């Protein structure tokens, strides 16, 4: 491979399929590598920007 892909699905941070539906998707997909594009709720934008702990320790650089 090259320094610019391709990369699998279990490293992309998207909401995918689970179970038999994944086997079916990898069967019926032009490129099974590809993602739905919906972000993963636990991770994306968590903790919320108005509750970041890092703002209390922050000091002017």
């Amino acid at each position: 491979m090259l320094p610019g892909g391709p990369v699998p699905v279990f490293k992309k941070y998207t909401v995918g399929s689970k179970g038999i539906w994944e086997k079916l998707r990898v069967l019926l997909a032009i490129a099974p590598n590809r993602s739905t594009g919906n972000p993963i709720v636990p991770l994306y934008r968590v903790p919320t920007p108005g509750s970041r702990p890092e703002a209390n320790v922050y000091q002017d650089p």
Binding site: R45, V46, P47, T48, P49, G50, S51
Partner: peptide, 10 residues
Amino acid sequence: HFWLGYGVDT
């Protein structure tokens, strides 16, 4: 209006 909007978790 701010929690509904994901401005905060609490």
